[PDB]
Structure formats: C-alpha cells, structure tokens
Specification:
The structure is cut from a larger assembly and holds 11 protein chains of 10 kinds.
Chain H lengths: L6 E2 L7 H24 L18 H4 L6
Chain I lengths: L9 H16 L16 H15 L6 E3 L26
Chain K lengths: L25 H19 L15 H11 L22 H5 L1 H17 L11
The chains are: A mainly alpha, B mainly alpha, C mainly alpha, D alpha+beta, E mainly alpha, F mainly alpha, H mainly alpha, I mainly alpha, J mainly alpha, K mainly alpha.
Bound molecules: cardiolipin, 1,2-Distearoyl-sn-glycerophosphoethanolamine (5 copies), ligand EHZ and zinc ion (ZN).
PDB class: electron transport
Keywords: Respiratory complex, Respiratory supercomplex, electron transport
Entry title: Respiratory complex Membrane domain of CI, focus-refined of type I, PERK -/- mouse under cold temperature
Chain lengths: ~120, ~170, ~180, ~110, ~60, ~90, ~280, ~70, ~90, ~70, ~130
C-alpha cells in the first residue's frame, strides 16, 4: 500500500527507495551510536562467508555453520542456531524498516514545515 | 613439481570436533577405502617403482647455447638470420609457457580461495597484468608470420614513442 | 485407404461426411458422455430436418451454410484417434515395417535358420509369377471401352486366377510388428 | 581426499561402461536393460559419497584430468568442477535416471 | 483467419511489452530502506585496494 | 500390452454394440444383415453406427471406405483386416 | 531475464490451461516452472534457483512417468478427453499423480514447498517490475489450475476410455521406480533444504498476506478451476471465448512464426540466392 | 490373456498390491505433511512478526520536533 | 452407397490371401535354429585410484580444493594453533 | 473372453436417464444411450468428489501421526 | 466472421465455392482428371507389381522436375528489368552494406587503438 500512496495520491511525502537515508543521522538523534559488528573481518574470511552473507548477523551465522559441520550426520539438530541467525536478521530487517519509516516521516517534516514557512506574508 | 614454480600454500585444517553421538558415515567408508582400494593399489605401485629403479636411466634437458640475435645480424645474410629467427621463435615459446603458468597458477588460486578470490588472490592477478602488459608489448600486433625482424620493429616503433613522448 | 477415390463428390457424401466431422467435433467441446449424447441427438435433429428438401438449390444452400457454421464452431484441438492421420501414433511403427522384398538379399546363413519360413515364402513367390500373365491379360481384356478409367481393379472372375495386382495389398508390412 | 576426486571421475567411467559393452559383442549375451539400470544405481551411491563430503565440510575441487592442446597462451584441458551446483545436481540427475531406465524397460517392452 | 492471427499474436506481444514498461515506470518495492554492509561497504573485501582507505561509510543505529 | 483381437472377438463386439442401438432390433441383427435395406436404418444412422464401432475399437474408419460399411459383417472383416487379424 | 522468464511463465501456463494432451500439459508445466526458475535468476537469487531445479526434477519426472503408466495401460490414449476415473481403476498411479500434482502446486510440507515459496516471497519482497510481479503470482494460480485440470479430467470423472479394459501396473518395473521417486517427492525438499549451506540471507519478515500469498493463490487457483470444471457438466453448451483459441493453439506463436519463417527463408534460397 | 485378464465393460479387477502401495505412498505423504506441520509450523505463520511501521514514536526514528 | 458388387469380391478374395500370408508369417516350432559389483565397481575403482593418487595427485595443480573452513574456537591440526574464541554475543 | 449380457445395461439409475427425460420433453429420444450406460452402470457408478482424491489415505495418515506424536 | 484465406492458411475445401460447382463442365473435368491419374495409376501399379523385374521404376515425372530446375533454367533466361535490377541488388547490395559495416567498425577500432583508449586487457591472444 505504500506504493498506492506514492503512485496514486502523493509524490513527495513518500520517499524514494534509492535514497533512503535522505537525511543525516544527527537529525532528531543526538550522538546516535553506529552499528557494531561483532565478528572479526578475519573471522568471516576464515569461515568463508559469502560476501553477501557478511551482514551484521554474520556472527550468528558462523555459529550455525559451526554447528552444522559439527553435528554432521545430524542435519536436524542445529535448529536453535538458525532461529538465532534468523532473528538477528529479522531484527535487522526491522531496522531497515525503521530507517525507511524515519526517512518517510522526515521528508514529511519538510513538507509541513514548508507550509509552516509558507505562512502567508 | 617444483614447489617453487608451481607454488602451493601450506594447509590449515580445522581439527575434528564431533558433537553428535551418531557415527560419521564418512570415516567408516574411508577406513575401508584405505584397505580395499588404497592398500591393494599401494602394493602394486611400489612394485612398479622397484622395477624402475633396477635399470634406472636418465634424460637431460637440451640446453641451447645463445646465438647472435637479429638485432645484430647482417642484412641479407640468410645464414645468421636463420639461426637468429629460430633463437627467437624458440623464445616465443619459452615466453609462452611462462604465460601458461600464470594462466594456471592463478586458476588454482581462485579455486583454493573461493569467496575470497576477490582479495586473497591478488598476488597473482597483479602478476597476470605485470606479465600480460609485457606479452602485449612484444608479441601481439604481429601477424601469423611472426618473426624476430617484426618484434624488432614493433618495439622500435614504440622506442620512438618512449623518446618522442619523453622529448 | 483401401477403396479408390471417387472423381466428384455427390451431394449426399458431402452431407453425410459432415455428420461425422460435426458430431466428432462436438465431442471435443462436450467431453462428458452425457452432455454429448445429449447435445448430439440435438445435432441429428438439425440434419434430420431439411432432409427431404427436394429443392437441390436449397439443399446446396443449407450445406454451404452448414459447413461455414461448422468451420467457425469447430474445436481447435478435436479428438482425433491415436493411430489415424494427424494423430499421436500415426506412422509411429513404420520404422519397423520393412517392405518384404528385403528378405531376398539375406545371407544363406541367416536364411538357414528360420527354415520353414522360407519354404512357404518360395511357394508364394511361385504363386505371384504363375499368374502375372493371366492377371495383366485380365486387367487388359477387361480394359475400358475407350472410356473413363477409374483406379478400381477388377476381381478374379475365374477359378485359379488371383485378383489382379494382388502382390502388395496382400503380403504387405504388418501394421504393428 | 582422493575418495572425493576418485568418486567424481568414477561416476563417468561407470556410466561409460554400458556404452562400450554395446560396442563389443558382449551385450547380446548379458541383459543390457538390467545391466544399465544397476550401474546407474551404483553411480547414484558413488555420487552420494562426495555429496556427504561437501555437506560435512562444504569444500569444492577443480579436477584437471587430461590436457588436450597447449594452443600457445590458451591451454585447453578437460576439467570437472565439483562445486555445490555440480555434485548436488549429479546426485539428483542419476536418481531420476535410475527411476527412468527401469520405467524405460517396462515402457518400451516389445520395442 | 491468418490476419486475425497475426494481429492477435502481435497485439499480445505489444501489450505485454508495454505493460512491462508500465511496470518499470511503477515498480513494486517494500517499505524497506537500504541494506547495510559492515566495514566500508566491504571496500577491502569487495577486492578494494588495501593501501588506499575509502571514505568511511558509517551505519548508525 | 492388451491381448490381440480375433475374428470372433471382433465380431461379438460389433454385434454387441449394435444390439444396444435402440432402432436396430436386437433379435433381427444377424451379421449378414444389411443396415439400410434389411434392418431399416437411414443414411444418417450408418454414420452413427460406424462411429460407434470407431469408438469401440479405437480407430478411425476412413470415410471413403466407411461410406460402405453396410452389412453388419463388412464391419467385422474390415476392422479385422485393418488390424491384421488372421485368426 | 526476470522479464522474459516472467512472460514465459504465464504465456506457457495460459497455453497449458486449454491443451487436451496429457503429456503436452505436463511439458508446458515444465516450461512454466523453469520460467519461475528464470525469474529467480533474474532477481539475482542463484542458490534458490538451483534448489528449485533439484525439486523440480523429482515431481515433473513423476508426473510424466505417471502419464506414461496411464498411456501404456490404456490403448496408447494420450488425450485427457478419452481418459477418466483412473483413481478407482489404477489407484497406484493416481496416488503418485496427486502426490506429484500437489508438489507442483507447492502443497505445504512437500518438496515444492521448501524451495518454491522461498522464490514466491522473494518476489513479493524485492524491487521488481510490477507487471512481472503480478504475472508470476497468477502464473502460480494457473499452475494450480492446470494441475486441477489434469486430475479432474484424468482421474476424478466418469471413465471415457475405450470399452475393453486391460490395465496392469503391477509390473515391478513400473511400481518400483514410481514408488522410489514418490518417496523422493515426499521427503526430498525436507532433506535438501536443511543440508545445503546457508545461502542468500532470505527475508523471513513479511506482512502476513505476502508471507501466505503463495499458499492462498494456489488454494483459490484450484478452487476456481474446480468450479469451472463442474459447471461443464450442466447440459448447457459452452463454446470458446475469443481467447480460448489464443490459449489452445499455443498463443498462435506456432501457427504464425513457424509458417512464415520457414517459408520466407527457403523461398529466398531457391528463388533468389540459388537460381537468381 | 496374461497377468490380469481383460474386462469388457467392467471394472478392471485390482491386485492386492496395487491398492496397498497406492494408499501407502499417499498416506506417507499425509503423515509427512502432518508431522512437519506439528513439529515446524512456520510455513504459513512465519516465526517473525512484521512490525507496524506506523507506530514508531517520532523519537524512535529521529523525527525532529517540527521546528 | 455400399460396396460395389465387384469390389466386395476384390476385397473378398485379397483379404482371403492376406489371411494366408499372415498364417505363413507364423513361425514353426524350432524355426529359430540357432546353429558382483566388484566387476564394475571395484575393478574400475582400483584403476581410477591408481590414476588419481599417482598421476593427478603427483602433478601440480591438478586437484585443488577450497580451503577448509575454520571457525572461531576450532583447532588447526597442521600448525597446532587454536582459533581465538570470538567476541562475546551480548544479546 | 465372454462378454456381459447386453441386457444388463439399462439407462435408469444413471445420469443418462435425466438426459433421457429432457431430450424427451423435446420429443427427441437418443438411441445410443444404453451403449453409453456401462460408464455409469456399476463399479464406476459412484460419483468421485475432489476432496476424496486430495484426502485419500488421510484417515490412516492422521492415525499414524497421532501414534508417532 | 468469415475465414479469410491468405497465401498461407488457404481456403479449405469446404467453404470453397468452386467445390460447390456442379456445372456440367466441372463434373467433366473432375472426371477427366481422375482418368489421367487412373491411367497413370494403372501404369505404376502393373510395373511395380511385376514379377520378374529388377530395373529401376523411373518416375519420369521427377526427372522432368529436376531437369526443369537445374538444366532448363539458363536456356530460358531473358534479361529484363525486374531481373537485372533485382539481380544486382542481391549480389552487390549486402556485399556493399557489410563493407560499410565492417570498414566503419574496423576504422572505429583502429582510431581508438591509435589514440590509446581501447583497453585490450588480458587479451594476449588474437
Ligand atoms: C576415444 C576418443 C573418442 C572421441 C570421439 C569424439 C566424437 C564423439 C563420438 C561419440 C560416439 C558415440 C558412439 O557410441 O557411437 C555409436 C553411436 C551410434 O550407435 P548405434 O546407432 O546404436 O549403432 C548402430 C550401428 O548400426 C551399429 O550397431 P551394432 O549392433 O553393429 O553395434 C556394434 C558396434 C561395434 O562397435 C564398434 O564399432 C567398435 C569400433 C572400434 C573398433 C573395435 C575396437 C578396436 C580396439 C583396438 C584396440 O557398432 C557401434 O555401435 C558403433 C558403430 C560405429 C563405431 C565407430 C567408432 C566409434 C568410436 C567412438 C569412441 O553414434 C551416435 O549416434 C552418437 C554420436 C554423437 C555422440 C554425441 C556425444 C559425444 C560426446 C563426446
Ligand atoms: C596426420 C595428418 C592428417 C592425416 C590424416 C590421415 C592419416 C591416416 C594415417 C594415420 C592415422 C593414424 C595417425 C593419425 C592419428 C594419430 C592419433 C594420435 O596420435 O593420438 C594421440 C594420443 C595421445 O595424445 P597426446 O596429444 O599425446 O596427449 C595430449 C596431452 N596433452 O595417443 C592415444 O592414446 C590415442 C588413443 C586412441 C584410442 C586407442 C584405443 C585405446 C587404447 C589407447 C588409449
Ligand atoms: C516417527 C517420525 C517420522 C518422521 C518422518 C520420517 C523421518 C524424518 C527425518 C528424516 C528426513 C526425512 C526422510 O525420511 O528422508 C528420506 C529421504 C529418502 O531419500 P529421497 O526422498 O529419495 O531423496 C533423495 C535425494 N537425493 O532421505 C533420507 O533417506 C534421509 C534418511 C534419514 C533417516 C530417515 C529415517 C526414516 C525412517 C525412520 C523414521 C523415524
Ligand atoms: C579420457 C581419459 C583421459 C585421462 C586418462 C588418459 C590415459 C588413458 C589411458 O589410455 O590409460 C593409460 C594410463 C597410463 O597413462 P597415464 O596414467 O595417463 O599417464 C600418462 C600421462 N601422464 O593407464 C593408467 O596408469 C591409469 C589407469 C586407470 C585409468 C582410470 C580411467 C581413466 C582416468 C581418467 C578418466 C576421465 C573420465 C572423463 C569422462 C568424461
Ligand atoms: C551496376 C550494377 C547494375 C546496375 C543496373 C541494374 C539494372 C539494369 C537494367 C537494364 C535494363 C535493360 C536490360 O534488359 O538489361 C541490360 C542487359 C540485357 O539487355 P537486353 O537483353 O537488350 O534487354 C533489353 C530490355 N529493354 O543485361 C545487363 O547488362 C544487366 C546489367 C546489370 C546486371 C547486374 C548483374 C549483377 C550480378 C551480380 C552477381 C553477384 C553474386
Ligand atoms: C537470434 C539471436 C542471435 C544473436 C546474435 C548476436 C550477435 C551480436 C553481434 C554484436 C557485434 C557487435 C558487438 C558490439 C556492439 C556494440 O554495442 O558496440 C559496438 C558497436 C559498433 O558499431 P559501429 O558500426 O562501429 O558504429 C557504432 C559506433 N558507436 O556500437 C553500436 O552499438 C552500434 C549498434 C550495434 C548494434 C548491433 C546489433 C547486432 C544484433 C545481432 C543479432 C540481431 C540481428 C541478426 C541478423 C539480422 C540481419 C540478418
Ligand atoms: C459444431 C458446428 C455446428 C455446425 C452445424 C452445421 O450447421 C450442421 C447443421 O446443423 S445445418 C445442415 C443440416 N443438414 C443439411 O443441410 C443437409 C441438407 N441436404 C439434403 O437435404 C439433401 O437433399 C439430401 C436429401 C441428400 C439429404 O439426405 P441425407 O444426407 O442422405 O440423409
Ligand atoms: Zn509393454
């Protein structure tokens, strides 16, 4: 439905996917701390994680992969490890959704504030 | 193989760390392969090599003395130039298997380092251009009638440029 | 495939051959048997009426508008049987229908086995050469009186004679070897 | 682990074995449909051995069996890769093939 | 009829090709911002030059 | 797969079907009994008969030769001749 | 390729809806499924595309040999029109056919389900052509439809086969392989998905309509197909709509591009390049 | 006639094995679908709940106080 | 229509002959007068192994393998090192 | 191979009968129905419902599930 | 609508008016053509079904076809317009088209190589 808003009713309010952080992080965020990668650039390189899979969840992945090589004959027992990885990622998709919504709203700020300044003069 | 002409990196292997009661279906099989496939073969092979070592013979590698190169070779003297177009057509190949090795040494370095080839394997690819930029600069424009006189000219057309550009 | 093609077609055979193309192209739209056995006895009705039209002109005006009604109300993928021209098995087994004049170049070793087979084959080949004369003569003595010739061939008409030109309708590759 | 390399080379040799049996006079004497069906069956089992290896360790192998021409700079050689795509597919394909040859014996009976 | 065929086939082709264009104009994309890769968008690992450090690309919480 | 036909099993099926056609009396159908001169059926009913047979035996009688499957027997040798049944 | 894979998916699927040849319908389904496989490669999701290749092999192989069983058991009838009620006459193949049919329609917890819905939701979540996204999903509903077409006409209907019946599927050579692949069709998606190396970093987070879209569209695809098929038996004649033709004769690409090209490519050689 | 004899206009007789093998393959299909559904019901539901993007306090996203 | 009385005899007679031809085609008794995995699994295997462990293995870059995977906290057999355990997962 | 008595077949009791009755209102009567009777006559007489095929073996399948569970 | 025969997808036999023609003449040709074919048919059928024959049935109708198509062409050639204009567009037309297709490419390539832009990387062969 986001699309319906962007393609059917409005054009500016809805942000463009190509440029999601249209705004600097400081806005409405004093000293926001940046994401921290747990895994070592080397740890990944030694676990031969596909570049794409080197996400901020790379660390829970390496765990899964560990418990998948170990526990070899049993491919149905590294189940907790998969939930974790997935969660980490769900908890990342949500972030990527929070960032998109924040942009959206911020661009709206611009519009409403445009009118604010657009106050008759 | 010369560990140095065909290098090969040292091996690092994670140690066995089973965490399951079940029995690995691989370890058992190997224990068999090693007895019913390897031992039988191993026995034969040795017996081969002792048959060889009885009448051990040797073969050397023809070393070609270096003759005078076209750069120095009278004009029209078909004798000297013939001995000097061969000396080059010979090095047109020795300078080609070298490039065969870099074609190969690399191929291995991207099978041995998958998902890291982008990075770990850049010792070679830097060389595959350090060697390709040269092979391109001494043997490429030439026709199928490649001759030392033409490499002499392909170079010397450009030695002007490394002298006209410089000037 | 057996009988010979008539020169021109009558009115009847054109009408009665639509009753086939039509009813058979009605079992491709109406697949279930019941719907068919219904929607088809209703078809005959269409042909049943306008059966006794004596006015040829009219009759050939019902036929020419029937075959256009049909062309536009036909099924693209009708039900054509498996082994009939245009079918799914048409000429499938023809890769195994060798023409029987090829057992004549077999090595005396091959024909050594299968012994009684060739003992009966040599009888039939004696039959074929023993009548070519009486046949061709028949074919000719009974020739047309300088008139229209069809592709029909005469029967025997005398004992001992074999139907004229019978070597390839008989002794023909078996359909599904 | 030669067990891996040999297995990848072996499937090809085992499957080629039915092809040359028909080249020699031997196939008339044994049953070709039954013999071929069995060897694909054994090929599937042989394919399984590398598949477990890959899964246990997730490692690949480039196998350069024979050189065909140097052709100067572009050397040409016969190489079989054993990446996840190749061995996973090799096992799935032979299982389907093992299924079909037995189906083939029933379907083309009387051919 | 043959004409009916040629027109219909190509009509289909065109409508499709066109609709695919209407599509590229108006794509379907979920409400998700861009994916964030660690380090400098994996500058070094994407094979970047080890010596020349890239303009840091940082990702905040 | 299925067993091959016989000149008396290709005759019992042909009489069977016809005995199930309501117009053709089931007690006056005899193999040497013509469809249009002896049983009474019309021309349109010959097409319908043949078609039943084409569906009982699963093949198509060419019209040019189907236009003549009159006797209820011609159908029994033509079907058999087309299917190579030498009994 | 995302675009052309998408066009082939529906183009082939729509053609399959009206085809009346059992082998032909399965073949069109082979092309559609690969159209979906082409779509995932087009959306740069290579690992899952390979996963569908393996799962696709098990069930499509089953359905064909299933029809191999029906065609051989019947007097070589290759048309759904004359084949009916195989479910009671031959339960062994009918059981194998529906197992394969549901796998083709991505029934939950069967081999198609482990790989196919990953591909579906991948589409529903990526940035893509709107036309491609809509066609791929209805292509999925059509896969259920033609899947429904096969079992209703081939299996659940009064028999319409020729009157003498001689059906035998007891031969070990029929059952065994069909039995063996059926075991693969039931358990392969379970085994392959867990065993393969983690890859692609899928997006399991979706609004529920998109998470369950593959399941629902497949369900109503059959639902809609069921009703239409039933309506057919109502002593109410229903002829073709204008499109039915563009559907049954393969979109008319065969009728037109196979008669013009081979004609204007050979005419030019004999008449112009050779003789002139 | 070999194996099972043909049946003219009658329901082909069926062998014990034909029916049992057919019910066997189908029943295992259903046992597997039911077993996995119970043990792993994340085929329809999904084990991650979509966040409502429209309930994020403006503080959460850095939406400055307008002005 | 109906067969012509002289075509229901050329089909009468020729069918009679076809029936005899097909009888003659029938073969008389005697007509045809005629006058273990180790085999392909083990024997082929030894050879292959002989080839892979004594030609390929011996020659350079003939059997190359992706590096083995090493995770945090797992030991390297050849060198003896123990891969450092990773930074603790806080959540 | 004998053949079932032709008499056995009858149109009543099958869907052909309802087709028979309507065609009859129209005055028409199809004569080939009886031939098309064995389709609906016996063995194949029972109507087959779509849930029945999809759910074949579900009864034991669930019985098996419960036990394993 | 009405079927519309095109040079392809021709008018079927039915739907064809002339089929519905029963003028005396037509039924005189239609019966005069079977004769030619019956006559030819009974000249193939008692020469192919002839015992005691080894020679090759010739099918002279095929020999008249090949001669007409590869050895009766130049004896029936008269150079007109629509034949020489069309006999030069076919031999020199594309042959001149591709020359300006290959010259322009080869010239573009050469310029770029001369000016130093063409990369020619990792190309060590040609
Ligand atoms: C070594 C390197 C070889 C490289 C080859 C590269 C090109 C590809 C060749 C593929 C050959 C495939 C094949 O099996 O050929 C027969 C095969 C046809 O077999 P067929 O039609 O069943 O045979 C019917 C004949 O009437 C025969 O029926 P039959 O019942 O009498 O059968 C007995 C058998 C008798 O077998 C032989 O002919 C043996 C020939 C070698 C001499 C005998 C051994 C001598 C050993 C001396 C030491 O005859 C044959 O089947 C083969 C006849 C022709 C053989 C010619 C030599 C082929 C060598 C292929 C290697 O050819 C093909 O149709 C496939 C060709 C295309 C292959 C594509 C894939 C290529 C992949 C590479
Ligand atoms: C020559 C110019 C053109 C002349 C055309 C007409 C010539 C007719 C008269 C001569 C015909 C025979 C000679 C020409 C063909 C020669 C084929 C040949 O020499 O095969 C070479 C092959 C070894 O191949 P090689 O190139 O040494 O290995 C590549 C390593 N990178 O050696 C082999 O092992 C071949 C084996 C083939 C299979 C033989 C049977 C199996 C047992 C051996 C394996
Ligand atoms: C009671 C609970 C029963 C639960 C269901 C059955 C066991 C489920 C866990 C094992 C995985 C599912 C399975 O049964 O796998 C069978 C499958 C057979 O192979 P196939 O399907 O042909 O695939 C070939 C692909 N190359 O691939 C396999 O063979 C994997 C075998 C693993 C062990 C399966 C044991 C099944 C019988 C005991 C069940 C308990
Ligand atoms: C095509 C096969 C190419 C690779 C094999 C080439 C040699 C084939 C042969 O004729 O056997 C001779 C071989 C002794 O020679 P070889 O071991 O090849 O050493 C010379 C080159 N270094 O005899 C031996 O010592 C090896 C005996 C075992 C051979 C096992 C089967 C061949 C191994 C390569 C199979 C490649 C399969 C490709 C399938 C496609
Ligand atoms: C430059 C290329 C040709 C450009 C002109 C092409 C059209 C020429 C039109 C000529 C019209 C008159 C004519 O018939 O042709 C001239 C000559 C035959 O002339 P004549 O037999 O007297 O016919 C009199 C007709 N009023 O017959 C001729 O001389 C024809 C001259 C052109 C023939 C071009 C054939 C090129 C074949 C290339 C094949 C490559 C492969
Ligand atoms: C069925 C499927 C068959 C597929 C066959 C594929 C064959 C591809 C051949 C490509 C050859 C050229 C490759 C590079 C083309 C290119 O994009 O860049 C170079 C091209 C040079 O063009 P140039 O004439 O020098 O002038 C333009 C200067 N900027 O600069 C340009 O871009 C100019 C425009 C080039 C357009 C080339 C289109 C070629 C299409 C070939 C297939 C379709 C035609 C088939 C034959 C039709 C005629 C019979
Ligand atoms: C599905 C496609 C629908 C197409 C239906 C198509 O229009 C058929 C239809 O109902 S409309 C024509 C009905 N039928 C006639 O138009 C024949 C009239 N022809 C005569 O009446 C002759 O004079 C004759 C006496 C020879 C007939 O006698 P008979 O054929 O031997 O029995
Ligand atoms: Zn069979």
């Amino acid at each position: 439905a986001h699309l319906t808003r962007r393609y059917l009713w409005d054009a500016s309010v809805e942000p463009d996917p190509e440029k999601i952080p249209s705004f600097p992080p400081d806005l409405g965020f004093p000293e926001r701390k940046e994401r921290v990668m747990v895994a070592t650039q080397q740890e990944m390189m030694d676990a031969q994680l596909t570049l794409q899979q080197r996400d901020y969840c790379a660390h829970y992945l390496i765990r899964l992969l560990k418990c998948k090589r170990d526990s070899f004959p049993n491919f149905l027992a590294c189940k907790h490890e998969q939930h974790d990885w997935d969660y980490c990622e769900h908890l990342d998709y949500v972030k990527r959704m929070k960032e998109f919504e924040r942009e959206r709203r911020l661009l709206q700020r611009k519009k409403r504030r445009a009118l604010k300044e657009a106050r008759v003069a | 193989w010369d560990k140095d002409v065909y290098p090969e990196p040292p091996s690092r292997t994670p140690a066995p760390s089973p965490q399951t009661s079940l029995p690995n279906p691989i370890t058992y099989l190997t224990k068999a392969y090693d007895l019913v496939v390897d031992w039988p073969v191993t026995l034969v092979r040795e017996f081969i090599e002792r048959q060889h070592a009885k009448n051990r013979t040797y073969y050397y590698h023809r070393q070609y003395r270096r003759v005078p190169d076209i750069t120095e070779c009278k004009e029209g003297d078909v004798l000297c130039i013939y001995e000097a177009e061969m000396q080059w057509r010979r090095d047109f190949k020795v300078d080609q298997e070298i490039m065969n090795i870099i074609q190969e040494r690399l191929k291995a370095c991207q099978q041995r380092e998958g998902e890291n080839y982008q990075q770990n394997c850049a010792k070679e690819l830097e060389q595959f251009t350090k060697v390709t930029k040269a092979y391109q600069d001494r043997y490429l424009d030439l026709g199928a009638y490649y001759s030392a006189r033409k490499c002499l000219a392909k170079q010397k057309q450009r030695m002007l440029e490394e002298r006209k550009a410089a000037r | 495939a057996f009988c010979a093609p008539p020169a021109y077609l009558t009115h009847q055979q054109k009408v009665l051959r639509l009753y086939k193309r039509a009813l058979r192209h009605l079992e491709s739209w109406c697949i279930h048997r019941d719907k068919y056995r219904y929607f088809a006895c209703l078809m005959r009705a269409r042909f049943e009426e306008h059966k006794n039209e004596k006015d040829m002109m009219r009759a050939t005006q019902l036929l020419r508008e029937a075959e256009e009604e049909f062309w536009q109300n036909q099924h693209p993928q009708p039900y054509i049987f498996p082994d009939s021209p245009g079918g799914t098995s048409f000429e499938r087994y023809e890769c195994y229908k060798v023409p029987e004049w090829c057992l004549d170049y077999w090595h005396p070793s091959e024909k050594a086995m299968y012994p009684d087979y060739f003992s009966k084959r040599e009888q039939w080949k004696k039959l074929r050469m023993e009548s070519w004369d009486r046949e061709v003569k028949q074919l000719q003595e009974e020739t047309s009186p300088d008139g229209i010739m069809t592709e029909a061939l005469p029967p025997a008409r005398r004992e001992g004679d074999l139907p004229p030109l019978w070597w390839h309708i008989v002794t023909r590759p078996r359909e599904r070897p | 682990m030669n067990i891996f390399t040999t297995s990848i080379l072996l499937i090809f040799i085992l499957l080629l074995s039915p092809i040359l049996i028909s080249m020699s006079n031997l196939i008339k004497h044994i049953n070709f449909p039954l013999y071929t069906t069995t060897s694909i069956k054994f090929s599937f089992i042989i394919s399984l051995l590398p598949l477990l290896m890959f899964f246990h360790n997730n490692m690949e192998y480039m196998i350069t069996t024979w050189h065909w021409v140097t052709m100067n700079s572009m050397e040409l050689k016969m190489s079989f890769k054993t990446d996840f795509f190749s061995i996973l597919f090799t096992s799935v394909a032979l299982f389907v093939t093992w299924s079909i040859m037995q189906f083939s014996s029933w379907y083309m009976h009387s051919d | 009829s043959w004409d009916v065929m040629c027109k219909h086939l190509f009509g289909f082709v065109a409508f499709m090709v066109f609709m695919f264009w209407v599509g590229h104009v108006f794509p379907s994309y979920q409400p998700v911002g861009p994916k964030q890769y660690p380090y400098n968008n994996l500058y070094l690992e994407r094979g970047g030059d080890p010596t020349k450090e890239p303009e840091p690309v940082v990702h905040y919480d | 797969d299925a067993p091959p036909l016989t000149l008396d099993g290709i005759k019992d099926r042909v009489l069977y079907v016809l005995k199930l056609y309501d117009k053709i009396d089931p007690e006056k159908l005899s193999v040497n009994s013509h469809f249009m001169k002896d049983l009474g059926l019309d021309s349109l009913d010959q097409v319908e008969i043949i078609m039943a047979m084409e569906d009982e035996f699963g093949f198509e009688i060419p019209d040019i030769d189907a236009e003549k499957l009159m006797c209820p027997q011609e159908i029994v040798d033509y079907i058999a001749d087309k299917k190579d049944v030498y009994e | 390729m995302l675009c052309l894979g998408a066009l082939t998916t529906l183009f082939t699927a729509i053609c399959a809806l009206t085809q009346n040849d059992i082998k032909k319908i399965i073949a069109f389904s082979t092309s559609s499924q690969l159209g979906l496989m082409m779509v995932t490669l087009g959306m740069n999701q290579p690992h899952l595309a390979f996963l569908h290749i393996c799962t696709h092999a098990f069930f499509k192989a089953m359905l064909f040999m299933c029809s191999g069983s029906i065609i051989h058991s019947l007097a070589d009838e290759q048309d759904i029109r004359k084949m009916g009620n195989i479910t009671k006459i031959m339960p062994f193949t009918s059981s194998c056919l529906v197992i394969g049919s549901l796998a083709l329609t991505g029934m939950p917890f069967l081999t198609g389900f482990y790989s196919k819905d990953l591909i579906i939701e991948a589409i529903n979540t990526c940035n893509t052509n709107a036309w491609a996204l809509l066609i791929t999903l209805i292509a999925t509903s059509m896969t259920a439809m033609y899947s429904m077409r096969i079992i209703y006409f081939v299996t659940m209907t009064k028999p319409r086969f020729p009157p003498l019946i001689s059906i035998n599927e007891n031969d070990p050579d029929l059952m065994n392989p069909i039995k063996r692949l059926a075991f693969g069709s039931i358990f392969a998606g379970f085994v392959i998905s867990y065993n393969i190396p983690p890859t692609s970093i899928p997006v399991l987070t979706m609004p529920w309509f998109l998470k369950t879209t593959a399941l629902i569209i497949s369900v109503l695809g059959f639902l809609i197909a069921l009703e239409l098929n039933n309506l057919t038996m109502k002593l109410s004649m229903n002829k073709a709509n204008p499109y039915s033709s563009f559907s049954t004769l393969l979109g008319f690409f065969p009728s037109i591009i196979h008669r013009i090209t081979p004609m204007k490519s050979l005419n030019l050689s004999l008449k112009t390049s050779l003789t002139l | 006639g070999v194996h099972i004899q043909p049946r003219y206009r009658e329901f082909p007789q069926l062998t014990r094995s034909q029916v049992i093998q057919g019910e066997f393959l189908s029943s295992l299909m259903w046992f597997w679908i039911l077993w996995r559904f119970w043990h792993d019901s994340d085929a329809v539901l999904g084990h991650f709940s979509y966040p409502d993007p429209s309930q994020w306090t403006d503080e959460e996203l850095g939406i400055p106080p307008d002005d | 229509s109906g067969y012509t009385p002289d075509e229901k005899l050329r089909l009468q007679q020729l069918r009679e002959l076809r029936r005899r031809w097909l009888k003659d085609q029938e073969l008389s008794p005697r007509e045809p007068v005629l006058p273990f995995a180790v085999s392909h699994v083990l024997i082929p295997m030894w050879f292959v192994h002989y080839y892979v462990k004594y030609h390929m293995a011996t020659k350079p870059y003939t059997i190359v393998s992706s590096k083995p995977r090493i995770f945090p906290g797992d030991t390297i057999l050849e060198t003896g090192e123990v891969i450092p355990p990773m930074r603790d997962f806080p959540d | 191979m004998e053949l079932p008595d032709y008499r056995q077949w009858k149109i009543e009791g099958t869907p052909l009968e309802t087709v028979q009755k309507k065609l009859a209102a129209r005055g028409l009567r199809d004569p080939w129905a009886r031939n098309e009777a064995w389709r609906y006559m016996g063995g194949f007489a029972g109507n087959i419902t779509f849930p029945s095929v999809i759910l074949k073996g579900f009864k034991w399948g669930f019985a098996a599930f419960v036990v394993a569970l | 609508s009405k079927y519309k025969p095109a040079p392809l997808a021709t008018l079927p036999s039915t739907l064809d008016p002339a089929e519905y023609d029963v003028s005396p003449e037509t039924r005189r040709a239609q019966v005069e053509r079977l004769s030619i074919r019956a006559r030819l048919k009974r000249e193939y059928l008692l020469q192919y079904n002839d015992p005691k024959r080894v020679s090759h049935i010739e099918d002279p109708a095929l020999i008249r076809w090949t001669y007409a198509r590869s050895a009766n062409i130049y004896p029936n050639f008269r150079p007109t317009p629509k034949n020489s204009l069309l006999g030069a567009v076919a031999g020199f037309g594309p042959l001149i088209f591709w020359y300006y297709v290959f010259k322009t490419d080869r010239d573009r390539k050469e310029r770029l190589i001369q000016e130093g832009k063409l990369d020619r990387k990792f190309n060590i062969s040609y």
